[PDB]
Amino acid sequence: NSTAELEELLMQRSLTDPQLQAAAAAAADFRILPDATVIKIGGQSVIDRGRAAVYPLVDEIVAARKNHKLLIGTGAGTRARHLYSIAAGLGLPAGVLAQLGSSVADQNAAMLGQLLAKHGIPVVGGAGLSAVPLSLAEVNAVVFSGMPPYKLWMRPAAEGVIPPYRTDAGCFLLAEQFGCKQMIFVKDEDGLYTANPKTSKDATFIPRISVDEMKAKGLHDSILEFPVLDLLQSAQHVREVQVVNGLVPGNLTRALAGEHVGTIITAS
Amino acid sequence: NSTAELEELLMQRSLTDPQLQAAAAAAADFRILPDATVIKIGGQSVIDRGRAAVYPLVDEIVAARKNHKLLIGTGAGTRARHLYSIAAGLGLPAGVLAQLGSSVADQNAAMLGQLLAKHGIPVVGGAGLSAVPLSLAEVNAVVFSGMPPYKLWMRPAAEGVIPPYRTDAGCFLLAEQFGCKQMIFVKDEDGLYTANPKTSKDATFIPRISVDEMKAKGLHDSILEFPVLDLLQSAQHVREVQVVNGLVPGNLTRALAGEHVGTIITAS
Amino acid sequence: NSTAELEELLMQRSLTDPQLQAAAAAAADFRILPDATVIKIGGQSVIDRGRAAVYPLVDEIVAARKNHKLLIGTGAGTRARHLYSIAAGLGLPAGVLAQLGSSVADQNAAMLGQLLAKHGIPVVGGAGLSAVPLSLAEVNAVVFSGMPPYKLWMRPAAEGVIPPYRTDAGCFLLAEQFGCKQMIFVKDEDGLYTANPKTSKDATFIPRISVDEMKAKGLHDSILEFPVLDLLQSAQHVREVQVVNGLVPGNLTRALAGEHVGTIITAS
Amino acid sequence: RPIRLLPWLQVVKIGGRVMDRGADAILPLVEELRKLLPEHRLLILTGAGVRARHVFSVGLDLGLPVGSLAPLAASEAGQNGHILAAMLASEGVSYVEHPTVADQLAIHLSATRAVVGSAFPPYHHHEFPGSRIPPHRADTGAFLLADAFGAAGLTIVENVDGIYTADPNGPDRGQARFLPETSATDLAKSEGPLPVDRALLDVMATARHIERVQVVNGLVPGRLTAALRGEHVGTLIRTGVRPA
Amino acid sequence: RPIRLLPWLQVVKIGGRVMDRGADAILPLVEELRKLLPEHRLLILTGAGVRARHVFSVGLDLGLPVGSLAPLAASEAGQNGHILAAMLASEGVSYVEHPTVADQLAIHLSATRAVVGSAFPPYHHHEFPGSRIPPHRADTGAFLLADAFGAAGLTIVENVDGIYTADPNGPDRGQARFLPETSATDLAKSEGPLPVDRALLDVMATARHIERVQVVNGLVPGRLTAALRGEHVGTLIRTGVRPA
Amino acid sequence: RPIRLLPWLQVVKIGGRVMDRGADAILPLVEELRKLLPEHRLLILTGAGVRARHVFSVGLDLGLPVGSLAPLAASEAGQNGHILAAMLASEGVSYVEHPTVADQLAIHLSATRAVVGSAFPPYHHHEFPGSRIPPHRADTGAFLLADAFGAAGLTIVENVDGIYTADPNGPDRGQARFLPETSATDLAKSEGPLPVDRALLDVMATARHIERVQVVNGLVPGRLTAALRGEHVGTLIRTGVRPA
Numbered sequence A, B, C: 001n002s003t004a005e006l007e008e009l010l011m012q013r014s015l016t017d018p019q020l021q022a023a024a025a026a027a028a029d030f031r032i033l034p035d036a037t038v039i040k041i042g043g044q045s046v047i048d049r050g051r052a053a054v055y056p057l058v059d060e061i062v063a064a065r066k067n068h069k070l071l072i073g074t075g076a077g078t079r080a081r082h083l084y085s086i087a088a089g090l091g092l093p094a095g096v097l098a099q100l101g102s103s104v105a106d107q108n109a110a111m112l113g114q115l116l117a118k119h120g121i122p123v124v125g126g127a128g129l130s131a132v133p134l135s136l137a138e139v140n141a142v143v144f145s146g147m148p149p150y151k152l153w154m155r156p157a158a159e160g161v162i163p164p165y166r167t168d169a170g171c172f173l174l175a176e177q178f179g180c181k182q183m184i185f186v187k188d189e190d191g192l193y194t195a196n197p198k199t200s201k202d203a204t205f206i207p208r209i210s211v212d213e214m215k216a217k218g219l220h221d222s223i224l225e226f227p228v229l230d231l232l233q234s235a236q237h238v239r240e241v242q243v244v245n246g247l248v249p250g251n252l253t254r255a256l257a258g259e260h261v262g263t264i265i266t267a268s
Numbered sequence D, E, F: 001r002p003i004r005l006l007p008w009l010q011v012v013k014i015g016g017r018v019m020d021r022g023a024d025a026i027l028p029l030v031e032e033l034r035k036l037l038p039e040h041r042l043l044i045l046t047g048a049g050v051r052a053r054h055v056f057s058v059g060l061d062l063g064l065p066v067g068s069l070a071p072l073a074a075s076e077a078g079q080n081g082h083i084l085a086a087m088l089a090s091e092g093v094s095y096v097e098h099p100t101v102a103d104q105l106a107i108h109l110s111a112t113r114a115v116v117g118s119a120f121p122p123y124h125h126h127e128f129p130g131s132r133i134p135p136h137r138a139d140t141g142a143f144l145l146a147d148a149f150g151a152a153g154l155t156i157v158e159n160v161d162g163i164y165t166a167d168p169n170g171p172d173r174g175q176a177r178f179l180p181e182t183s184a185t186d187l188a189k190s191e192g193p194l195p196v197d198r199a200l201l202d203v204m205a206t207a208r209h210i211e212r213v214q215v216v217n218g219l220v221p222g223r224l225t226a227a228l229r230g231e232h233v234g235t236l237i238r239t240g241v242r243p244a
């Protein structure tokens, strides 16, 4: 097999070719940032709450950055919902909406980023090859914007103009591509339940579940965006995620230390 | 009372209404970079001379950054004055001038940035989103462009096309917003006198003065722009600034320790 | 008559006047990055080969990065040739080609940047915005795009539409301006021979050469682009460069230590 | 006095509250703006509205100073701009950034009849201290820019008939008086809620070109159309400058 | 149902493999595009082609994930875009970046008759996992863009007459029969190499506006012109959308 | 012989020293440019002038290399570009950056009749070594770009009637004779002060398209208009272009 097999197939076959797809699917796997963890700070879950929920989690982040490398994503929250209600009633397609809610993720990133400035952790631009914020044993952290940059090219849903891929997927997708050891979602609920947490019937806390079981239980989209689960079965580097309750202090640092607090969702 | 109250009134009132502004005026005050000092490296006073004037302050800057976190602003100088005479005689409004003088403050920043490169201190890109340079005990510094980004939206004066708000206030306003413990202006004179200094009628050095006194003694514009005083009367985080002499070495570093050499203008 | 009179000479004279040019030839010589070296990773020579040549030099750079401060430029390689073969057949001038090959230098820079990301070495968000990567003794390196930014203003050649100033000159010229002690060229051959390395039975490696002998010897373009040696005869800061073999490990670090390995080309 | 840089420009500004009312409010205004395009050369600047009030509450709850809050609201006006630019897109309209509004506006109005931008000025971190609410907001950014270019007029489109001496939707509606005409000086002495930036009064004090600004109700069709013709459908404000 | 943002736009997509053939393929195409400029309002998007396969081979040999490979392939479509725009420059044509395609197109197509861009979407590091070859390529990006705007149609220009039962140049070249008409669903279930992305078939399922896409051979002049008038010169791929 | 990308373009260049004379010099030049806009398709590139010297003395006084001084002078031509762009704004003229000049020029010249830019090339840190004053200055950047586009001609507008045997301003007025016409090769041999870059003479040797350049006095009106029609009011130059 040695010098190069594909110097034939990449030149002479279409990229939809199954004979080509398999040979690319067996190639070296490189992890760009294997020892870094990505977090999502929910826009509605955490940041739209303000000082009460945010400051404790801010104190946590500084404490973790020493022993951990942290990639901090932000969420949209209620302001993105208003933009969707206004725009969705006008009839504008999902592509227009995607860039509307990206602003709100940037706003939260700006706000969140300014609380952490004195510690030396910036908001990211022209980064992703920029490992200096993450590389410095003093900082080892960054703040970025949860939303994926699809704006007009956003894949729409089966029905409705609300963008299917949002700060969950944007944060997840950044971990998957960069090799991150973990992916943590920080939200307002203890994790996944078998009914709607605020109004439920028997609701049984699910400490662990796999995707196909989630699809089973009608849970496709309870805590995380539904495409993110299908993205979880396709992910090559991060085969599982964790949903923790930020409203309960210490849970962020715990799961960063590797404990199982909250729900963990597995691809297989 | 509960930090609820302004969010309903923030939903229902005009923000010019006093009942809304007041409770918004009393919230936690967060200092983004409380332990940082802002300096102004004068365009006319310092940089227009070159090696004689610059290198001494360059060597000083290195000595302080170890024990201090420093934001280095620059001024425009004579080239900005040339642009002002040319454009103002054409009839161009104040707003146009603001972007014309922004170049030279950027020019001087570029020049200064190259003398400081081997010492590791950058010029701010991406509008300055990067806090990484100041946080690192190795670097602890940045170089920026004193001019504020008002450019065509610059507020004009009562008379004349010359922009009222310039590198003095642009450096000041960044200290005010960032929490910075200090704001230092580095110019060519030890501080304030009572006459136009160049006339040199042997006036009296004022070691310390307050803004309202400045209005009293007719020293109205004197060295710091007229608005820089009114911005000081409203300023929350920096209630006083310091005017020091660059031409005499040691004045910067002594002033960096909090010593009283030179003048000080206070909001009270 | 002297070098201090210039500020009258620049106002009242044209910049092509030799008494101004000669008087300009004697001014302070300032080295912005004297302790940094610029290297070139050939796009065709090294990176287009893939893992075999690339991974070893990555390990070298990291191993070297501690004792030296590195600016890593990249080359375009075969994809730029196709763009040039495609573009030159349409009749497009060199200026158009210049931006076409700039992409590939950007591409190769990106690829390399992700292999070096985990080690803390970034890719630049513009070339003069960061000396900070070099500042941090932990990083002491950066990856950028060898192509010079001439794009449409690129000077054409004597014959042909192919841009004369390419990733060789782009990396060289940045060392020249920033003071960098050395310029190391990392390519696939041991250095210079008096005929083409691929096909010679009889060609003797030239260990050391000066430019004047090179054009004399009929080698105006074997190893480096023909104009950069003219850039070497005009250079005030980098009077010599080094061409080494990447395919043989260790040659980079040895030349980084100042060894005579490979061909060395001198201006005088 | 300075020169008029774009003497043929009409600057209109659409309050952020009008956009918050949704398709019910917007579709009548888009269709009305669709009509004006051939008549005028229009720069349409959007305000922020309710979403910006939510960013302040959070931004204030976190202790952030006024200079951090300004760019966070200007993003909302920017998002209201993107909404209007899309609905008029098929008419050749696009949202343009602040940097192009400053330099290249003349090209784009030569390309098309109209453009959209954020009324908010780029003060972002250099916003003035003293108030925990940024002094220079959309209304002020719209006037500053109208008076920089030398425009023929600035029209402010809001959800109320005009200015009332007391808040029409706010506190007591029994003493709310509509003011068919008023001055920047008369208002600068009035302490109370206004559908205006208090900083708009400051920029009007130094205004070099624009002698009048009308505040009109964007929820009644034809009032914007008529306002741009100088007909008095709403509140007029004298800025104290004479090309009279 | 959403609204059509630029209902009068015809979005064309020029394969990356067409460009790889040099002046012989391209120069007849420019002369045909100069002919089309007055007839339609055109957004012309370039694919990547072979050079992207070279970045893949190199990028794959280094182990880089698919999300690193996507921006590097989109870079070539950007390079193919710069060439076609340059040959058409004297006709008022220029290449525009993703942000201008996303925001300012309606202004720029109001200024000039046409513009050029990269069909590749700005997915860059957020490209989907599962495949080591980026799923969303020029074909997929050009449809996504056409179908958001509400354009009158998307036309795909390649080096083969249309879609066949197998690579008509590949090992089965003899055994390949042409399919003058096909549906996105019939294509999504049939396997083999295709001139179009499997992602084009997935995005067509959620398509709100565009009911058909034709794949025509840009190596036969006049087929682009005729396809843009609705004459059937190539493969008609139905997206499963109904008109009204 | 490459192809002409914009064969219908006229490139004009405005010296920075002309702008330094203030309203007295500029207002006659702007009003003359207002006349030319409907007649020609114009790209206006400004030189730097005296302000670039002030940065040189300082930047040189600090020892900065030639590559550090170039971006600081190009900023002055950029600021001279912003000034002239403003006075012509009301006619649809704007200043555009290097990146739009390189990629998008043809669209904006389809949008408007003319645009303004800096003549200086974006060489900044890649400026050539050997001289402490940047070799490629406004004149060289203006020609290099003109000859890439294929412009119909390049006309240089300065504060002097043309080229003389010696600078007729400096200590020797005695030996200075006017040169109504000269060749690019003749100048590269004869040494002495020039109103143009000695590097401008180098780019002319490899020039593929433009066979002549005229140097005219911009302080006497009517000379630019006549120059753009080919009338000989000043010093011409032979660049050595030909069919073979």
Ligand SMILES: Nc1ncnc2c1ncn2[C@@H]1O[C@H](COP(=O)(O)OP(=O)(O)OP(=O)(O)O)[C@@H](O)[C@H]1O
Pocket: A013, A014, A015, E014, E015, E016, E017, E018, E046, E047, E048, E049, E050, E052, E137, E138, E139, E158, E159, E160, E162, E163, E164, E165, E166, E167, E168, E169, E192, E193, E194, E195, E196
């Ligand atoms: N069913 C098929 N039908 C027709 N051509 C096929 C088919 N399968 C493979 N091919 C071949 O692949 C070529 C087009 O496929 P490919 O996507 O690789 O090129 P491309 O579309 O121009 O690239 P890009 O998407 O970057 O623009 C055809 O010219 C044809 O040679």
